[PDB]
């Protein structure tokens, strides 16, 4: 039985070419170049899914730092005071409060300042 290769190959070629819509130049037209770019794209996506959590945490920390310095307190002392006070709001919702409900953020800053020690540089 002589077997022609067309159907089996066309299947995966169509899959790869469809996945490469929107690419520039050869990378969206030719199957080989599109396949190379697909390897790179999936590697990039895998790496970026891991890095995205850190990126968003960095953005939240930036916003919380801005809103805390607006209340005359630094981010690190505010985090220490919030941990001491036992409140368990994470940085995502802390930034959400900072942007959407400034009064709530000010109240949390007040409780964090209350929970802080009297001399932060003491050998405690």
């Amino acid at each position: 039985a002589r077997v022609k290769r067309a159907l089996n190959a066309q299947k995966k070629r169509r899959t790869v070419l469809k996945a490469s819509k929107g690419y520039r130049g050869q990378r969206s037209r030719l199957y080989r170049k599109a396949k190379e770019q697909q390897l790179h794209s999936l590697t990039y996506a895998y790496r970026d899914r891991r890095a995205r959590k850190g990126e968003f945490r960095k953005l939240w920390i930036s916003r919380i730092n801005a809103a805390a310095r607006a209340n005359d307190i630094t981010y690190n002392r505010l985090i220490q005071g919030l941990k001491a006070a036992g409140v368990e709001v994470d940085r995502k919702n802390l930034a959400e409060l900072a942007v959407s409900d400034p009064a709530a953020f000010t109240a949390l800053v007040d409780v964090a300042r209350a929970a802080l020690p009297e001399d932060v540089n003491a050998p405690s």
Binding site: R49, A104, L108
Partner: protein
């Protein structure tokens, strides 16, 4: 008024009538569940003490169990010949918050 509820290792800011995607819970659609709270913001005063947060809970109704977006994984290392294809679809539940 709104609260920050914890479920599945994560926290979400919800108000009454909010619909939020959440990690899978062992509950049938149309049922109701109660969730712990990490902060309550009612009007102006903010509830933050642990005991007061323990005295309150947020009740929500399970709308459905859905699936996350399809994720395609193709691990690759050049000049090696190593490839590893893998897919993943996370399971999720959709909760509508009934009240706080």
């Amino acid at each position: 008024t709104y609260a920050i509820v914890k479920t599945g290792g994560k926290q979400y800011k919800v108000a009454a009538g909010d619909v939020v995607k959440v990690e899978k819970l062992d509950s049938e659609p149309g049922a109701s569940v109660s969730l712990p709270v990490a902060l309550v913001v009612d009007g102006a005063n903010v509830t933050s003490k642990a005991d007061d947060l323990a005295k309150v809970a947020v009740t929500a109704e399970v709308l459905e169990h859905t699936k996350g977006p399809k994720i395609r994984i193709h691990k690759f290392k050049n000049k090696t010949g190593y490839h590893k294809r893998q897919g993943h679809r996370q399971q999720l539940t959709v909760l509508k918050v009934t009240g706080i």
